[PDB]
Every structure is written in C-alpha cells, then in structure tokens.
Design a protein around this ligand. Structure first.
Ligand code: T6Z
Ligand code: ZN
Ligand code: ZN
Length: 229
C-alpha cells in the first residue's frame, strides 16, 4: 500500500485521494513524519499541506507528475508551522496558486514561513467564506476554533468518507497532544469536537502525525484535551 518515492511515502486512500508523508529530523524528537493530501478532481490535482521542506515539496510535485500527470490547480495549507507550510516556495516556483487562513499568512513571516498567495476568511460558524476559496472542487474548508494553533484549519473531501484534521487531531491510541507550544489549551477540546460535527459522515480521519484512523481519533483527542482545562 505504501509507496516509497525518494525520501517520501505515498499511500492511496480512495480512488482520487492519496496521503503524502515527509520526514524531518527533530533534534530531541527523532525523524518526525508529517502527512498531507493529494486529490484528483477531474482534470486537475489539489494539494493539502506542503512537506517540511522545499526540496521534499518539489518531490511531491514530481510524484504527481509521474503518477497522475495532471496540473496542480491549487494548494491549501492548514497552519503556519514548518510541517504544513515549509515548502511554500516550491509551490510558488511551480506556478501553483496557494491558499491559507488569513491568520496563517499573517503569522508566516514570524514563524519563518513564506505566506501563501491568497487568504481564506471564515464565517462566525467556522465555514470558509466561499468567495475566498474559489475553484476548491470537493475540498470543504472549516475553521474549528483554536486548538493545536489559533490558526489551524481542517478540510473535508466531498464525495469521499475522508476528513483531514491536520495537527488538531491525534490517533485513537495517542498518548499526548504533541507540540502544544502554540496551542490554545482552553479551547482545544471544543475545537476537536467542532471538527467532528462539521464532517459527520467522515469515517476516515486523516491527520498530520499518524496513519488514518476511525472517528475514535476525534473522540479520543477531545477527551484528552478535556484534561488541559
Ligand atoms: C518541537 N516541535 C515544534 O516546535 C514544532 C513542530 C511541528 P507541529 O507538529 O506542527 O507542531 C513539532 C513537531 C513534532 C515534534 C516537535 C515539534
Ligand atoms: Zn503545528
Ligand atoms: Zn504537527
């Protein structure tokens, strides 16, 4: 199932959906995997999250060229940390339109990230304002509230059973909530539950640092975040 392609790993999740995985040595944490998504929508490809680095992100584009061979119409990145935005320059060098939460773009320079070209804004209930996410096809973008970071966003794939929680959601056996350095600990639990309520039909939950899991990832993450209060 897993396909090793250079230093990256790709896994098909559905007929039109693949997970990309890249690794970065975290001095003190080992070589940390980070996952994003690749979605074919008709004659074009949509990407969720970069890899950790520009070189790795260029390799994602190389894999897309070889395995799908359709243009990448856009990428959306899910918060202003390196695992999700570290490869922005590679997307720009490739001519790909890029999108992030307005707050992620505001934070990008101080986080050492390059901002996306376009800013998403969100209604009070968390759903993306559609005018800011043109041509997103099956991607349904939802801001669940502050959690792993204040800017974290999530993405459902219409027509599939898949929703992507990024670094907000941990797997059903996870022992911790990971890096809380930029987290909102008071609101995390509610934000995790809001993600679940936004995508009630998603039976496959994809996340940044674990293999895809059932919805028990959501309940378990929320129950763990209850202890942060
Ligand atoms: C220590 N530290 C960080 O400062 C930031 C990240 C990326 P993120 O997962 O988006 O928070 C991180 C990831 C895994 C392990 C340690 C880490
Ligand atoms: Zn993060
Ligand atoms: Zn993470």
């Amino acid at each position: 199932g897993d396909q090793r392609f250079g230093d990256l790993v790709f896994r098909q999740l559905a007929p039109n959906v693949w997970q990309h995985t890249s690794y970065l040595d975290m001095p003190g944490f080992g070589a940390v995997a980070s996952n994003g998504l690749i979605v074919r929508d008709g004659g074009r490809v949509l990407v969720v999250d970069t890899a950790w680095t520009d070189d790795q992100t260029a390799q994602i584009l190389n894999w897309i060229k070889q395995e799908i061979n359709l243009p990448v119409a856009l990428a959306v990145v899910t918060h202003a940390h390196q695992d999700k935005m570290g490869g922005m320059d590679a997307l720009h060098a490739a001519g790909i339109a890029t999108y992030a939460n307005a707050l992620s773009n505001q934070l990008a320079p101080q986080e050492g990230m390059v901002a996306a070209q376009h800013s998403l804004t969100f209604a009070a209930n968390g759903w993306v304002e559609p005018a800011t996410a043109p041509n997103f096809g099956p991607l349904k973008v939802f801001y669940p509230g502050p959690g792993h970071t204040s800017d974290n966003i999530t993405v459902g794939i219409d027509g599939t059973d898949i929703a992507f929680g990024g670094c907000l959601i941990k797997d059903s056996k996870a022992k911790s909530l990971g890096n809380l350095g930029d987290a909102d600990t008071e609101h995390y639990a509610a934000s995790a539950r809001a993600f679940g309520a936004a995508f009630p039909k998603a039976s496959m939950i994809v996340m940044s640092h674990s293999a895809p899991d059932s919805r028990a990832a959501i309940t378990h993450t929320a129950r763990m975040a209850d202890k942060l209060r």
